[PDB]
């Protein structure tokens, strides 16, 4: 019924628009995961060797 009055714009973004530099943040966190993973894996592999 509302749409018959006027076009409706629904923001279902969850607030992502309030994060500055989303790509840089994403790239950094993807790194953070990887480093931690690698360190434990390197220790594991070295422990095996």
């Amino acid at each position: 019924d509302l749409c018959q009055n006027e076009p409706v714009c629904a923001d279902l973004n969850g607030g992502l628009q309030f994060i500055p530099n989303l790509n840089e943040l994403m790239t950094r966190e993807r790194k953070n995961l990887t480093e931690t993973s690698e360190i434990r894996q390197a220790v594991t592999k070295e422990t095996a060797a």
Partner: protein, 62 residues
């Protein structure tokens, strides 16, 4: 010349090659500081004090 099975007095002293390893990454240093035999002297020396350093190893093996 002969066949000898007495190992009680057998030994070898070896002056090992002066070796080098360069710690380009934290990972290398974590690998290094895993070693209980790698007994840091000034243990308050940071791990990354060694980051980007070539450590030089003078060793003797008995």
């Amino acid at each position: 010349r002969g066949v000898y099975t007495d190992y009680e007095n057998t030994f070898q002293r070896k002056v090992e090659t002066p070796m080098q390893v360069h710690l380009a990454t934290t990972k290398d240093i974590a690998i290094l500081r895993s070693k209980q035999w790698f007994v840091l002297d000034d243990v308050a020396t940071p791990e990354e004090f060694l980051l980007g350093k070539t450590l030089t190893f003078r060793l003797h093996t008995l």
